[PDB]
Each structure stands twice: as structure tokens, then as C-alpha cells.
Write a protein that binds this DNA or RNA. Structure first.
Ligand SMILES: Nc1nc2c(ncn2[C@H]2C[C@H](O)[C@@H](COP(=O)(O)OP(=O)(O)O)O2)c(=O)[nH]1
Ligand SMILES: [Ca+2]
Ligand SMILES: [Ca+2]
Ligand SMILES: [Ca+2]
Ligand SMILES: [Cl-]
Ligand SMILES: [Cl-]
Ligand SMILES: [Cl-]
Ligand SMILES: [Cl-]
Ligand SMILES: [Cl-]
Ligand SMILES: [Cl-]
Ligand SMILES: [Cl-]
Ligand SMILES: [Cl-]
Ligand SMILES: [Cl-]
Ligand code: NA
Ligand code: NA
Ligand code: NA
Ligand code: NA
Length: 326
DNA sequence: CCGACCGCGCATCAGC
DNA sequence: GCTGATGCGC
DNA sequence: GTCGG
């Protein structure tokens, strides 16, 4: 909230380029500019001041000078008044509708939540589920509920096999008072990078959580990534709990630390961390960190014993999850 | 004054 | 079936 | 849109 006006302004322009113009690199440019302004420890006074930061160029500095002088931005006033632009934006908020499908619907005259429910035969399984819980998925999750959900997941995993290990990540791990959804990192001695000694390791766990009626729906599912829906049990004659998005990612036991770093985030922290890695000569994904060659290829993975080891390779002071909250 | 931009899981489509 | 691309998501 | 090749 230090420079809250500017970073809100740029986040709004970022969404317009992603969802309407389908310019993903203009989207990423606006998120970078808003995120560096957010870490800047002063109240900004001019476009020429902001231009000194990396990722603010001539055009964004001219927009900050308009906003500080007038309290508004004209380009965002036209965007906000364009019906077609604003319909396309709203549609992408449904799980499973992106910019491509949102523009095709709007070109076909489908432009409200009522229009969607009337045209359910134009939607795939994913989009239909995202429409079903649309209001529920717009809601935050209090840390007190995340606590109960974690107790249920850890207890049932232990009943399947006591050698599984499950860890709640995402914004919860970063200490947030509320989260957007629940993210679970899972490992088992039988799935390593070297060998898969047992079948259906992820399937076995989804199944047990379905049979005690914790998981309620599947958006997508493979051998390592599950994307779906879940719900806490309610008491007699109390309002049910909102349904919630859940993601479970099975990672090889020996690559747990790269995996838990990716899964803890945030998204723009990850993006900035991997960009810095590149200018230091490495590449980071959720499995490994590797160095790059003169060709550009990645070499063999480097040993890792902790989250801190990865910050060390790229020469970063360690950051506890609560300070990765960009 | 043009050409790249973090990295990948799952579902589906074109050309073969 | 496969590549390689599009689309949507973490 | 920005930065760097
Ligand atoms: N490299 C990279 N990592 C990402 C990206 N999006 C998400 N991740 C990671 C960081 C997130 O904390 C984690 C879970 O996704 P999320 O639930 O949308 O984020 P969150 O609100 O819990 O932080 O996935 C992404 O776009 N790029
Ligand atoms: Ca998530
Ligand atoms: Ca989350
Ligand atoms: Ca995100
Ligand atoms: Cl772009
Ligand atoms: Cl307005
Ligand atoms: Cl009608
Ligand atoms: Cl809320
Ligand atoms: Cl389902
Ligand atoms: Cl399900
Ligand atoms: Cl798979
Ligand atoms: Cl890898
Ligand atoms: Cl670049
Ligand atoms: Na700059
Ligand atoms: Na309008
Ligand atoms: Na969406
Ligand atoms: Na992709």
C-alpha cells in the first residue's frame, strides 16, 4: 500500500494485454514494472524517478506522470468503457476459459454469467466445473480452515502408507492469513528420479481422499499432477463450507527441495528468481538446477540438500517463505 | 533499431 | 500412434 | 513494453 495507486494501475494494464491483446510479453512487462515499484521503499514522486528502476521505460514513466498529476489514466478510462474489452476480461475469470476461448465466445455474443449457463453445451468438463463453483472460487480461505484441511490430508495419507510425506505449500506456507487455494507436495521412497518401484502412487492417494469424501471433483489428472476440488465437513444445520481448488503434485523423493521451492512461490518471485539464474549461468525448474553451456544446453543436475542450497548457487541471501511474498 | 523475454503438467489438434 | 504447436493452468 | 544485442 506504499505505492498502491501505481501498482494497481499497472496490474490492470497487465491483465488487459494478457486477456484482450493476447500479448503475453506485454503482460509480463507490466507485472515486472509493478513488482519492482512494490519493493521500492519510497513514495514515488514523478515518472522520471520511476524510470530509474529496471523494467520501467519511457511509456510507463509517462503514464505515472499522468496518474500523479490527475489521479487517473486516460488509456485505462477508454479500456474500462469498451464493452467488448470488458466482457473478454470477465470471461477469463472462469476456470478453464482463457483469452482465446473468451474472445471466441464474445465474438459469438456470449458475454455474461447468464449467457454461460444457457450455453453449457459449448463448454468442456473443466469449464463446466469452473462455472459450477464460480462464486466459491472467487473467495479466500482463512488460515484457520487451511489448518483443518491440512489435518485431514495428513491423517488420510498416513492410512494409505505411513512412508508418504505430504507438505502444504503455496501462500499458506508463506504465512498468509488467507489463501487462494491449497497446494500439496507429496513424496514416497518408491518414486525417485532413478526408479519407479510401485504403480499408481498418486492414484492411491487421490482414491483414499475421495472415499472419505474430501476430494469432490477432478479437473485434470496424470501420473504426477492432480488438479481438482475439495471441501471440509460441516456440522448439522450449519451452512456448508465453500468448495475449494486443490492441486497435488507428486515429486521424486530425491528432488524434494527444488520441488518445494517451486511450489512455495510466489509466481513473480519464481519468475524473477529464474531470470536471475539465467544471468548467473544456471537454469531452475521444479526438479533440478543445472548450468548452461556455450551452445545453450543444460548440463547435469547439481546436488541439493536444502532450499537454502539453491539460493546459494545463484548468490542470494536466504529468504524465508514469508519474504518470498512478492 | 529489431528480436527475445521462467519453465513445464495435462488435454487436444494438425500434419504425418 | 508419433512431433510440434496451441491452449489453459501451477 | 523494456532492455540489450
Ligand atoms: N515458475 C513459475 N512458477 C509458478 C508460476 N505460477 C505458480 N508458480 C508456483 C508458485 C505458486 O505459489 C505455486 C502455486 O500456484 P498458486 O496457487 O497460483 O499461487 P499462490 O497464491 O499460493 O502463491 O505455483 C509461474 O508462472 N511460473
Ligand atoms: Ca494452486
Ligand atoms: Ca495457493
Ligand atoms: Ca499467477
Ligand atoms: Cl507480447
Ligand atoms: Cl472510468
Ligand atoms: Cl436464448
Ligand atoms: Cl473472501
Ligand atoms: Cl470429476
Ligand atoms: Cl474427483
Ligand atoms: Cl502422466
Ligand atoms: Cl530436469
Ligand atoms: Cl530479452
Ligand atoms: Na528503467
Ligand atoms: Na462499456
Ligand atoms: Na480462466
Ligand atoms: Na505449454
Amino acid at each position: 500500500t506504499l505505492n498502491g495507486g501505481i501498482t494497481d494501475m499497472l496490474t490492470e494494464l497487465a491483465n488487459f494485454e494478457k486477456n484482450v491483446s493476447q500479448a503475453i510479453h506485454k503482460y509480463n512487462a507490466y507485472r515486472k514494472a509493478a513488482s519492482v515499484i512494490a519493493k521500492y521503499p519510497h513514495k514515488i514522486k514523478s515518472g522520471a524517478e520511476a524510470k530509474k528502476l529496471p523494467g520501467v521505460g519511457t511509456k510507463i514513466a509517462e503514464k505515472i506522470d499522468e496518474f500523479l498529476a490527475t489521479g487517473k489514466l486516460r488509456k485505462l478510462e477508454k479500456i474500462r468503457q469498451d464493452d467488448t474489452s470488458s466482457s473478454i476480461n470477465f470471461l477469463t475469470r472462469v476456470s478453464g476459459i482463457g483469452p482465446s476461448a473468451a474472445r471466441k465466445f464474445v465474438d459469438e455474443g456470449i458475454k455474461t454469467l447468464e449467457d454461460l449457463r444457457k450455453n453449457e453445451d459449448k463448454l468442456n468438463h473443466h469449464q463446466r466445473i469452473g462455472l459450477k463453483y464460480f462464486g466459491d472460487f472467487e473467495k479466500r480461505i482463512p488460515r484457520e480452515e487451511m489448518l483443518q484441511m491440512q489435518d485431514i490430508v495428513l491423517n488420510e495419507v498416513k492410512k494409505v502408507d505411513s512412508e508418504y510425506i505430504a507438505t502444504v505449500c503455496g501462500s499458506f506456507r508463506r504465512g498468509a492469513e488467507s489463501s487462494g487455494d491449497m497446494d500439496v507436495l507429496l513424496t514416497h521412497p518408491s518414486f525417485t528420479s532413478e526408479s519407479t518401484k510401485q504403480p499408481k502412487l498418486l492414484h492411491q492417494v487421490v482414491e483414499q481422499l475421495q472415499k472419505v469424501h474430501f476430494i469432490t471433483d477432478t479437473l485434470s489428472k496424470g501420473e504426477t499432477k492432480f488438479m481438482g476440488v475439495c471441501q471440509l465437513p460441516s456440522k448439522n444445520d450449519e451452512k456448508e463450507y465453500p468448495h475449494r481448488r486443490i492441486d497435488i503434485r507428486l515429486i521424486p523423493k530425491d528432488q524434494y527441495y527444488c520441488g518445494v521451492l517451486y511450489f512455495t512461490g510466489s509466481d513473480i518471485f519464481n519468475k524473477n528468481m529464474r531470470a536471475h539464474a539465467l544471468e548467473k549461468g544456471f537454469t531452475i525448474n521444479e526438479y533440478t538446477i543445472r548450468p548452461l553451456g556455450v551452445t545453450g544446453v543444460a548440463g547435469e543436475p547439481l546436488p541439493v540438500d536444502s532450499e537454502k542450497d539453491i539460493f546459494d548457487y545463484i548468490q542470494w541471501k536466504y529468504r524465508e517463505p514469508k519474504d518470498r511474498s512478492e
